[PDB]
């Protein structure tokens, strides 16, 4: 018995959404 | 399929019995206090019910740790007085964990409605024993003959046994080849038809329930 | 293809051996995926539905599962007689499991076959049988058909009621039954009924489970029927307020907490002073804040303006704000905070300070513990504080500064979220930001000493605010934001992350610099070339910001300067470009951001294309004899007129993008529309100027500083427009003056790149499969059907949803537009279809275009579907020729 709510509603960082250019630029580039 | 198509949706209420009782997190209940409840010499069906009835809203995953505790303490519910409620709660939660690891719990429920009168001789049947020989469940105790939940236990795992024997006969013909196949279908027929003259001498009445 | 995988499929089900079968059938459902099409479908469910009549039963409950999974592509089985009587044959069956099986299938398949009669009757008889599963099966089915089909409902309310209240019915499934009486809201009289019935339950089985499941019947009843829903929360309060035990007063929190989102208008100001008190003198912690979850999701309706002083909602808030109960103390805050933003009666405005002070005491609360419950109830606080800062402004300010000074005493996760909403507060509101930089700076500083782990989003979240805060650009914190990262940060990605943060708000400088750094890392080609490309475009934004007011001279040499780099970095785009990562709408607004520059620079020429005399041919006898530069303007009005309607276009392909990006694709058509007016209004047309600028927005309500400063520049340009409209012959210095000073203007302030240009979130798209080099007589004229299934991502709306598909067809012959129709349908279960008639009166090749756009819910077009084409060969029959070759000689 909860909610989530998102304190900023246009914040990049949520990765509620992850897109294969991202995934394959994340793991190719951190470290 | 009958251990299956019980795990299907009828109208959600046990979802929102779940939502609604079981989130006091009064999760007390553990398999050893129902075990002290079952080993109470003066012993209190009324608490044995306050456990076994909060297990009724557990899921089949969650209730896994109880089994040894409500197969191994449920020759104890064959003795006289002890209420029908107990044993329909029982029955549920043995198809409740049929659903889940039937094998297991067979074999521990065949192991637990033993007669025990020669009990030092504990025969511990294994599941290789009983498909091998399925007719071993229909050696319990007599009084599961009129005890409606436990016979209906008994009968699942008749059923059950009789299919695995089916497959353990043709694996170890297989195995064993390197007719046979009609000593096989034999030997299974036989089988089942002794199933059935064991059940139907169970439907008769006794000679005490004659007079 | 679709039928090779479904015979391989359909071999499985043939071989006999159980487990094959089993195999193929549980591997059905990844073909509908596959192949959702209609044709697919159908064959693949009579296959199935074959397999149901003649397998076994662990084979029909294969089935019933498949089925089950696949309750939205039932709608394209179109076959639906022979499917259903193939399986309904196995409801006579001696076999109650078959049975009940059968009773789950027609039960899984209710929506496609209500009012079938047979099915009705099958309900009707199993749910009197002697077989227990068989009765469950039943009421399932039962269940079912209710909620599809009206005539079955109000024939099986009354056997329902008499097997509830039938003695001989156990508990078990007398609670069974009663989830069927939420669908008696087909007739008011029903419900009626319906309603009575279950008055009569609570009041004659007050068992915990009985009344629990009877009185949640009864709410979700009163929802679907909406005329008893006020006494159905009279009744919830009654027995929250009265019956003692626990679970029957959680029960009616949720019901009533279900009421407040789907009815909210419908409370009334007596419930909620029921509730109110309730929540006031109860003793346990949990029920008070189950009610307070339901007051804080009334409060956010619009049921708080329905209820109005200080009043029990009021006292009650102020007294849960500061609960020992971080849950209790949230949902408090929350309805303070409701009240204080939606309200802005002067009786109430003593507890404005109490909202701030209850959030600040709950960011205290929630700060140090890092656990997850605190890390939602900090959520909630911070939600509320970034509201309260846009419902009241004046209170930004120590909102600002409570969050500053949490800051230096947070943990780390607790300082993600608050610089999350300080981005938030300073993004709505660019004034508190000047004020906001010194705390963080000092904070990144002594973060990125030390950080190792964790440390990485917070770096970015603390980059964020930095720019987001900064409404001019940086010299100091740029240096030190530089050595943060090249110091210790050998983690690419969050040097990648602040670099997208910094060309979001325009710090183009930081961001070519990192982008700079982040090469040499990647490993593969392509990502090289974007991120050169990401450091090319920065370097093109940052070579325009040295640009003087009035220099016209410098402003062509910035404006060639970032054009050079602007082509270095579309060459480096499309080098990144890859199949399954197009890189379409970079493409295009990086394109559309080339044009626009150079057609300013071409603006400028012609600002200095005046210098250059007229004849005097011509100026002896309006507008031509200005000479050259009046066809040059007309070419500069011409130009930006296509470049608005190609950002128009980049935004109406652009379905999938979030708002903001959007709003600044808006903001660079509206540049382009301003130049054109300005160009129209100055020297073309100054008689036909239209109205004045009255702004109907006049103070608009912007979401970003380039937001602003957009339209400030649009302001400001028309102000100087209107005020030199017929004061000048359009041979006037002054006119070029102001479009020269106009694109100064606009181009002075930095472009900011959204979100679409980085992450794609929505990703949908149509199939679009058309049933044909394709022959096709004169006489007769083509019958085209096109299918087309809307495509998703994860999340399918995230930002908009397909409300309705226009299916535009076109012809064009010798491969020109001769066959013109659209077609609106709605896609039920994300497919759609229909037929087009296609004339080919005329003889030879036809090249047939299909392009699919979709309408939203709020009605805007989107030009978002595959424009796919087939070819016709129209050739003349062999009868008709004959004909007429017979007829001619």
């Known amino acids: 018995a909860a909610a989530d709510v998102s304190v900023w509603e246009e914040n990049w960082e949520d990765d509620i959404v992850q897109d294969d250019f991202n995934q394959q630029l994340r793991l190719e580039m951190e470290r | 399929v009958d251990d299956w198509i019980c795990e299907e949706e009828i109208t959600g209420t046990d979802a929102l019995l779940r939502r609604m009782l079981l989130t006091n997190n009064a999760k007390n209940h553990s398999p050893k206090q129902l075990q002290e409840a079952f080993s109470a010499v003066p012993v209190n069906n009324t608490q044995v019910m306050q456990i076994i009835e909060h297990l009724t809203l557990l899921s089949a995953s969650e209730l896994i740790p109880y089994a040894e505790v409500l197969t191994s303490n449920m ?105 046979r196949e009609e000593l096989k279908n034999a030997l299974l027929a036989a089988q089942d038809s002794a199933a059935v003259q064991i059940l139907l001498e169970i439907c008769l009445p006794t000679e005490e329930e004659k007079a | 293809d679709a039928n090779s995988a479904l015979m391989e ?150 056997k329902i009621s008499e097997m509830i209240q039938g003695l001989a019915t156990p508990v078990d499934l007398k609670l069974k039954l009663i989830p069927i009486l939420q669908h008696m809201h087909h007739d008011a009289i029903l419900a009626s009924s319906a309603r009575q019935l279950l008055q009569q339950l609570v009041t004659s089985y007050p068992s915990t489970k009985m009344v629990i499941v009877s009185l949640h019947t009864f709410t979700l009843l009163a929802a679907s029927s909406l005329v008893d829903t006020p006494k159905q929360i009279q009744l919830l309060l009654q027995y929250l307020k009265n019956d003692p035990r626990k679970a029957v007063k959680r029960l009616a929190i949720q019901d009533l ?55 029990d909602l009021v006292k009650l808030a102020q007294e849960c704000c500061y609960h020992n109960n971080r849950g209790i103390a949230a949902h408090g805050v929350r309805v303070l905070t409701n009240i204080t933003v939606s309200c802005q009666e002067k009786d109430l405005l003593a507890l404005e300070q109490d909202a701030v002070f209850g959030l600040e005491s709950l960011l205290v609360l929630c700060s140090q513990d890092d656990s997850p419950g605190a890390q939602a109830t900090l959520k909630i606080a911070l939600n509320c504080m ?194 399954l990562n197009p890189l379409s709408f970079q493409c295009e607004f990086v394109k559309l951001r080339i044009d626009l520059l150079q057609a300013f620079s071409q603006l400028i020429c012609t600002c200095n294309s005046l210098k250059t005399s007229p004849p005097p041919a011509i100026a002896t006898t309006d507008l031509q004899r200005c000479g050259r530069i009046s066809n040059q303007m007309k070419q500069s009005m011409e130009e930006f007129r296509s470049l608005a ?73 028309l102000e100087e427009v209107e005020s030199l409209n ?36 929505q990703s949908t798209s149509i199939k679009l499969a058309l049933s044909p080099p394709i022959a096709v007589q004169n006489n007769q004229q083509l019958a085209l059907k096109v299918e087309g299934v809307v495509q998703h991502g994860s999340k399918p709306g995230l930002f908009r949803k397909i409300q309705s598909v226009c299916l535009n067809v076109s012809s064009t012959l010798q491969s020109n537009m001769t066959n013109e129709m659209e077609q609106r349908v709605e896609p039920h279960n994300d497919y759609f279809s229909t037929q087009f008639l296609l004339n080919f009166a005329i003889l030879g090749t036809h090249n047939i275009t ?40």
């Not at chain 3, 189950?290 to 708080?304: D, F, K, P, R, Y």
Request: charged share 20%.
């Open chain 3, 386 to 579: 970034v509201k309260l800062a846009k419902g009241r402004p004046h209170l930004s300010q120590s909102v600002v500064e409570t969050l500053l000074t949490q800051l230096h005493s947070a943990q780390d996760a607790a300082r993600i979220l608050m610089c999350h909403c300080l981005a938030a507060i300073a993004m709505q509101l660019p004034v508190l930001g000047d004020g906001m930089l010194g705390d963080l700076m000092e904070l990144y500083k002594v973060i990125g000493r030390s950080a190792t782990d964790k440390q990485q989003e917070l770096l970015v979240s603390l980059a964020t605010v930095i720019f987001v805060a900064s409404q001019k650009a940086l010299s100091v914190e740029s240096k030190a934001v530089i050595k943060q990262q090249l110091e210790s940060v050998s983690n690419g990605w969050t040097v990648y992350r602040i670099a997208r943060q910094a060309s979001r708000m325009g710090n183009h400088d930081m961001a070519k610099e990192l982008y700079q750094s982040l090469l040499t890392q990647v490993a593969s080609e392509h990502f090289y070339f974007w991120l050169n490309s990401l450091k090319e475009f920065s370097h093109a934004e940052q070579c325009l910001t040295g640009l003087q007011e009035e220099n016209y001279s410098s402003a062509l040499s910035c404006i060639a300067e970032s054009l050079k780099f602007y082509h270095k970095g579309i060459a480096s785009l499309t080098a990144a470009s890859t199949p």
């Open chain 3, 850 to 889: 299909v392009e699919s756009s979709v309408k939203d819910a709020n009605g805007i077009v989107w030009k978002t579907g595959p424009r796919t084409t087939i070819f016709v060969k129209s050739l003349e029959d062999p009868y008709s020729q004959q004909i007429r070759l017979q007829q001619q000689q």
């Open chain 3, 9 to 158: 499929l359909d071999k499985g089900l043939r071989s006999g051996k159980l487990g094959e079968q089993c195999e193929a059938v549980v591997r059905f459902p990844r073909l509908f995926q596959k192949y959702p099409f209609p044709i697919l479908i159908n064959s693949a469910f009579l296959k199935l539905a074959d397999v149901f009549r003649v397998g076994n039963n662990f084979l029909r409950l294969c089935v019933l599962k498949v089925t089950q999974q696949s309750e939205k592509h039932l709608e394209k089985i179109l076959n639906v007689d022979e499917f259903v009587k193939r399986i309904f044959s196995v409801i006579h069956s001696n076999d109650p499991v078959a049975r009940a099986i059968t009773l789950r299938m027609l039960g899984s398949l209710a929506s496609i076959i209500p009012e079938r009669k047979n099915a009705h009757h099958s309900i009707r008889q199993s749910l009197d049988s002697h077989d227990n599963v068989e009765v469950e099966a039943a009421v399932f089915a039962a269940a079912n058909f209710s909620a599809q089909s009206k005539d079955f409902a109000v024939g099986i309310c009354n």
């Open chain 2, 75 to 179: 020759s104890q519910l064959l003795n006289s007085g002890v209420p029908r409620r107990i044993l329909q709660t029982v029955n549920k939660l043995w198809m409740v964990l049929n659903t889940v690891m039937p094998r297991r719990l067979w074999v521990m429920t065949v192991n637990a409605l033993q007669p025990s009168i020669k009990f030092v001789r504990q025969q511990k049947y294994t599941q290789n024993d009983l498909m091998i020989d399925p007719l071993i469940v229909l050696r319990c105790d007599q009084r599961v003959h009129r005890c409606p939940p436990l016979m209906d236990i008994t009968l699942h795992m008749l059923n059950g046994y009789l299919l695995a024997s089916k497959a353990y006969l043709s694996a170890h013909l297989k195995e064993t080849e390197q007719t």
């Open chain 3, 645 to 717: 309607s190609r950002y128009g276009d980049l935004y109406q392909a652009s379905f999938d993008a979030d708002s903001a990006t959007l709003r600044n694709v808006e903001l660079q058509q509206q540049s382009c529309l301003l130049i054109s007016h300005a160009i129209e209004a100055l020297i073309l047309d100054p008689e036909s100027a239209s109205f004045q600028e009255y702004g109907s927005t006049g103070t608009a309500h912007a979401d970003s500083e380039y937001e602003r400063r957009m339209m400030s520049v649009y302001n400001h340009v």
């Open chain 3, 726 to 761: 017929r004061k000048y012959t359009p041979v006037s210095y002054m006119h070029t003056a102001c479009l020269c000073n106009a694109i100064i203007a606009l181009l002075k302030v930095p472009l900011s790149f959204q979100r679409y240009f980085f992450q794609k979130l």
């Open chain 3, 257 to 311: 907490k279900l009421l407040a989102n789907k009815t909210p208008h419908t409370w009334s100001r007596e419930n909620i002073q029921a509730l109110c008190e309730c929540a006031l003198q109860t003793p346990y912690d949990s029920l008070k804040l189950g009610m307070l979850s339901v007051l804080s999701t009334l409060s956010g309706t619009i049921a708080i303006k329905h209820y109005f002083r200080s009043s």
